[PDB]
Design a protein around this ligand. Structure first.
Ligand SMILES: Cc1cccc(C(=O)O)c1N
Length: 119
């Protein structure tokens, strides 16, 4: 029932994501010089270094907020991809499955801790 435990759990999950080869296209903001039409398609860029920095700055109040930004990295990849068979999009799908498999317990534990606090 530790209400703060999600933060280190998210830090550790981001460390695993950064070690995953599938995260490399998503570690830093998409290069606008390499993809000059990116901002014509994508309204809100997001990347894992921005997520980690937001977490480390104490600018997430809950793991749900972190999860919304990570999901935005994946929806941006799906929206920008020219093909559902593209290399970078395929990497995003695998990374998303890995993230969802690991974030589930973080969210469950946090929500349970909050319910216990308000019991
Ligand atoms: C950022 C991004 C997401 C999804 C697909 C691509 C691609 O160039 O195929 C891409 N550059």
């Amino acid at each position: 029932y530790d209400i703060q435990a999600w933060k280190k759990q998210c830090e550790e999950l981001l460390n695993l994501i950064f070690q995953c080869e599938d995260s490399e296209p998503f570690r830093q903001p998409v290069d606008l010089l390499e993809y000059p039409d990116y901002r014509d398609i994508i309204d809100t860029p997001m990347d894992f270094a921005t997520v980690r920095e937001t977490l480390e700055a104490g600018n997430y109040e809950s793991p749900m907020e972190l999860c919304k930004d990570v999901r935005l990295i994946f929806s941006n990849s799906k929206a920008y991809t020219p093909s559902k068979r593209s290399r970078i999009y395929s990497m995003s799908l695998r990374l998303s499955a890995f993230f969802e498999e690991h974030i589930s317990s973080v969210l469950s534990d946090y929500k349970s801790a909050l319910r216990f606090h308000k019991r």
